[PDB]
Write a protein that binds this ligand. Structure first.
Ligand SMILES: [Cl-]
Ligand SMILES: [Cl-]
Length: 162
């Protein structure tokens, strides 16, 4: 198990544009295209990301390429953030993956204002972090996935993923 399989499990794989849990146009492995409600705007974003006139459908390879880029970007957002980085560097590999997942899902901004959680993780107070992270919209909106992520942080193992 690793970050890629992990997210492949949480996000699934779809080759035609679809709406994510928030109702935003997405494609591939959780690749967000746009927050706007216009299908054509999404199609425009897609073509631009792929480099060709796609008509809203892409290939597996193409999905995989976006994915790669996206993981990469998430790590990099982490490393460039002053609040996150320190936390990240303090963690073990398995938990790092948990942190990436979250950033992938909600953005830097997103995970960066979980200050208290951050503090607790930095301290390696896992059970406590786990309760704090659950007091969130995130958890209430996507409970099965948040649970997986939180037990990851809590246990440092991949048991939630099998
Ligand atoms: Cl892109
Ligand atoms: Cl969920």
């Amino acid at each position: 198990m690793n970050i890629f399989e992990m997210l492949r499990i949480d996000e699934g794989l779809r080759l035609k544009i679809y709406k994510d849990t928030e109702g935003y146009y997405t494609i591939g492995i959780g690749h967000l295209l746009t927050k706007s409600p216009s299908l054509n705007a999404a199609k425009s974003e897609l073509d631009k990301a792929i480099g060709r006139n796609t008509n809203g459908v892409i290939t597996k390879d193409e999905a995989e390429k976006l994915f790669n880029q996206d993981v990469d970007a998430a790590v990099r957002g982490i490393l460039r953030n002053a609040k996150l980085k320190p936390v990240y560097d303090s963690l073990d590999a398995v938990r790092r993956a948990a942190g990436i997942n979250m950033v992938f899902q909600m953005g830097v901004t997103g995970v960066a204002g979980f200050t208290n959680s951050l503090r607790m993780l930095q301290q390696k107070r896992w059970d406590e972090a786990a309760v704090n992270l659950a007091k969130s919209r995130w958890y209430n909106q996507t409970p099965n996935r948040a649970k997986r992520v939180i037990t990851t942080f809590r246990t440092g193992t991949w048991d939630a993923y099998k």
